Design a protein around this ligand. Structure first.
Ligand SMILES: [Mg+2]
Ligand SMILES: [Mg+2]
Ligand SMILES: [Mg+2]
Ligand SMILES: [Mg+2]
Ligand SMILES: [Mg+2]
Ligand SMILES: [Mg+2]
Ligand SMILES: [Mg+2]
Ligand SMILES: [Mg+2]
Ligand SMILES: [Mg+2]
Ligand SMILES: [Mg+2]
Lengths: 51, 95, 45, 240, 238
RNA sequence: GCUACCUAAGAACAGCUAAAAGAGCACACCCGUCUAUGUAGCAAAAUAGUGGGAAGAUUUAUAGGUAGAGGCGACAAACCUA
RNA sequence: GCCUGUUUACCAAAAACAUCACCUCUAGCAUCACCAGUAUUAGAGGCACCGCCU
RNA sequence: UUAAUUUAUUAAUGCAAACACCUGCAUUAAAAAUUUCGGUUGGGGCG
């Protein structure tokens, strides 16, 4: 194994990695709706109550 | 005064022998600093009329600062020793 | 190039390792006392 | 170390004094200030910064004749040998001070403002508001300590009660009792800024030496860094 | 005496009208104290009519001990608050002369040591928005670090936009909205971003209308919902 | 007593060219670019040639100072008795 | 790389270090350094002579 | 060094203590100090 490397990847957390994937894909998919979808996803979730 | 206490108990030395101390017996915890104790008062017997305290021969509890800085240095008061109390008692009964 | 670090001068010798300088401090006095205890012929330099 | 300060002379004199360089070292022998060492040998001319110093067995305002205006190795400002009565003394020359000029040193706070002529020393109370001043005292009779470098000029901003507000050349205000003396005009050698050193050797002549390791703390120089709070630790250095 | 005080106030630039106004303003204040206080205020470089206005607005200043007033005035001059600078300060927050020396000193020390603001920047902050002095430590440090780390703003821009003036709740409400919307990105380690960020004037200085119309391009109702959600988030975090 | 830096008070710098020079060529002097030799060597860093500076931020004698987590450092992790 | 200079005594003399120039930050002050000085000053850091455009 | 543990020491403050100076106790910094670098697997990885 090669211990020392010229450069290592940024070591993102999985949450940020998911955000980056979503930003690069859903932005194209949704155009101007992507910011709204993004803020909704990042905000709290609305829970319904099923009796 | 700073009062301290060993963290580590010192083994008993004996009757005539002296305790043998080690590195751990030099570790202390401050049990109290007397300077932070509430102020107490000094009992004095006045010799001259002084405002708001007394006139003469009356035992008075005065703040230690006043007693040691103004009254006693200037002779306006004397220590409330048994001898002073007795002398001022004869002074009172001779009036 | 190296080896000749000693450039003798009696003034420096005496001012640095002499009797007076040795006695000038308690540490130097103890240097002298150690030499005396060991029995050195030359106590100071 | 066997360091005894050369500033041992007790009696004021005109003769230049042989001053020993320090090399930026304490009396302990260790470097305290870096970048100091060498330079041309210099002699110190004791400057009398108390402009109103009436002679012995004398008092009141007195005049003085500017014997000469000389370059001082120990200052940016050039000095003036000036003589009055039966004494001579070095003072800081003002911008237009010339040999043969007359200088007035007074302690009189006139009810009206005295006509401020460059070079003369009056109590700050006696000056018109807005006059350029130098060699200002902090206290009455303390001696000039402020506005002493070449070309520097404070401004007498305000006068109220016995207190005057001065603007130091750093554009900071200072409160001084109006009884404290100051001399009018800007200090001499006004072109000191424009001087070009030209080469490293000239600084070395001026006694400035290139010196490294100027901090002596572990790791050397360390610029201050803002320590993040726990909430911000997550974003201190976000990877790209 | 009234004669001396009247002569002095005739001097110093005060006109008879303002002199009479201040004399009436005297709330049992000795003429000596009033003269000394006005003297200190004009020493600080304040003009006669602003002095009159300030004493009208806050008569308590006349009650300050002269020693404390002088110490505070010297401290303000050292801080650079003088001449025309002190005017808007004495209007926005006329209580700086009443605040404890320790409070001012620790605020400035937080701004310099723990916030790395230059001396000139600190004077500019205390000149534009003295409410910083009222604002408690810890909260101020959090606000500054929010600007620095999470928002990626530098001291020059913070001072230029008076970011410290705005409330932390408003700052968070707008910035977090932008960030989750993706219109604002924290600068990376290199200090760069994929898209240029909106300017702080566009973020905080503007009103909610333009803020949601030009920078966020969202709906007011959405913003209200986000604000309520964020308030709940802060409550839960505490 | 080496070496790094500094203090005090000293000293040296031909000749030519140029004119008051961190100027040119180049001795003394200082250094150590390149090559060869040497590699238990003449030498625990030298020799020969070649080369850089050579009136300067120069070189250098004398005495003094700074001491080990310290000093000193035109930062090479350099030097502080191989 | 502006330059002359400095450096790894003993494998590196260099583009590295310094350097005049410039910028930034800190300091309103005296009797042991800075300094027998005082903002045209002093300390620290960066940068690199200089000059022209953005 | 945003590894762990400390702030003895200085610098600030605060509280007591003596009526500028100083002692004790806290808090925050600066400066530092002490100590550690688990194991198995993986040559062109990002575990
Ligand atoms: Mg020698
Ligand atoms: Mg010659
Ligand atoms: Mg030459
Ligand atoms: Mg050197
Ligand atoms: Mg290096
Ligand atoms: Mg290295
Ligand atoms: Mg070069
Ligand atoms: Mg070598
Ligand atoms: Mg060499
Ligand atoms: Mg070589």
């Amino acid at each position: 194994y090669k211990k020392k490397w010229a450069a290592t990847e940024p070591k993102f957390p999985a949450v940020r990695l998911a955000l980056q994937n979503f930003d690069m894909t859903y932005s194209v998919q949704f155009g101007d709706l992507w910011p709204s979808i993004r803020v909704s996803l990042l905000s709290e979730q609305k829970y319904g109550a099923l009796v | 005064t700073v009062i301290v206490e060993r963290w580590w108990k010192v083994p008993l030395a004996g009757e005539g022998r002296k305790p043998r101390l080690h590195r751990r017996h030099r570790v202390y915890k401050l049990v109290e600093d007397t300077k932070h104790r509430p102020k107490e008062n000094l009992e004095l017997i006045l010799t001259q009329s002084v405002e708001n305290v007394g006139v003469r021969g009356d035992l008075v509890s005065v703040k230690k600062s006043l007693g040691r800085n103004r009254l006693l240095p200037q002779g306006l008061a004397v220590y409330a020793s048994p001898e002073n109390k007795k002398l001022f008692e004869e002074e009172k009964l001779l009036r | 190039a190296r080896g000749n670090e000693y450039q003798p001068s009696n003034i420096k010798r005496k001012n640095k390792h002499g009797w007076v300088r040795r006695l000038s401090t308690p540490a130097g006095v103890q240097v002298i006392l150690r030499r005396m205890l060991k029995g050195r012929k030359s106590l100071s330099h | 170390a066997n360091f005894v300060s050369w500033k041992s002379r007790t009696k004021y004199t005109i003769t230049p004094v042989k001053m020993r360089k320090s090399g930026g070292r304490d009396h302990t022998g260790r470097i305290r200030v870096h970048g100091i060492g060498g330079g041309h040998k210099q002699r110190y001319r004791m400057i009398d910064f108390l402009r109103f110093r009436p002679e012995e067995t004398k008092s009141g305002p007195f005049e003085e004749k500017v014997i000469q205006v000389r370059y001082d190795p120990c200052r940016s400002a050039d000095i003036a040998l000036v003589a009055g009565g039966s004494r001579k003394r070095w003072i800081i020359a003002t911008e237009n001070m010339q040999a043969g000029d007359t200088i007035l040193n007074s302690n009189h706070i006139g009810r009206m403002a005295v006509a401020a002529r460059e070079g003369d020393a009056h109590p700050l109370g006696a000056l018109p508001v807005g006059t350029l001043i130098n060699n200002v005292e902090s206290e009455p009779g303390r001696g000039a300590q402020y506005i002493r470098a070449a070309g520097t000029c404070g401004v007498l901003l305000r006068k109220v009660n016995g207190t005057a507000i001065i603007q130091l050349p750093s554009k900071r205000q200072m409160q001084v009792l109006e009884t404290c003396v100051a001399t009018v005009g800007r200090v001499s050698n006004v072109d000191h800024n424009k001087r070009v050193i030209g080469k490293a050797g000239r600084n070395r002549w001026l006694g400035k030496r290139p010196n490294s390791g100027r901090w002596h703390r572990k790791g050397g120089w360390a610029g201050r860094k803002i320590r993040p709070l726990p909430p911000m630790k997550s974003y201190v250095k976000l990877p790209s | 005496e009234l004669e001396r005080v009247m002569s002095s106030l005739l001097d110093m630039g005060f006109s008879n009208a303002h002199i009479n106004e201040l004399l009436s303003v005297r709330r049992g204040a000795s003429l000596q104290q009033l003269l000394d206080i006005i003297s200190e205020f004009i020493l600080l470089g304040l003009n006669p009519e602003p002095v009159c206005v300030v004493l009208k607005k806050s008569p308590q200043l006349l009650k300050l001990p002269i020693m404390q007033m002088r110490k505070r005035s010297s401290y303000l001059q050292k801080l650079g608050l003088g001449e025309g600078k002190l005017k808007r300060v004495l209007y926005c927050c006329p209580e700086i002369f009443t605040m404890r020396q320790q409070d001012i000193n620790d605020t400035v020390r937080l701004l310099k040591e723990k916030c790395l603001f230059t001396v000139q920047q600190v004077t500019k902050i205390l000149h534009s928005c003295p409410s910083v002095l009222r604002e408690d430590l810890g909260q101020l440090e959090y606000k500054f670090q929010y600007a620095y780390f999470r928002m990626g703003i530098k001291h020059p821009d913070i001072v230029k936009s008076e970011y410290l003036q705005y409330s932390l709740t408003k700052i968070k409400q707008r910035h977090i909205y932008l960030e989750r919307l993706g219109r604002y990105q924290t600068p990376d380690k290199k200090g760069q971003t994929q898209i240029p960020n909106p300017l702080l004037k566009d973020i905080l200085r503007v009103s909610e209308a333009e803020f949601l119309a030009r920078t966020a391009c969202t709906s007011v109702e959405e913003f209200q919902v986000f604000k309520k959600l964020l308030a709940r988030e802060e409550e839960e975090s505490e």
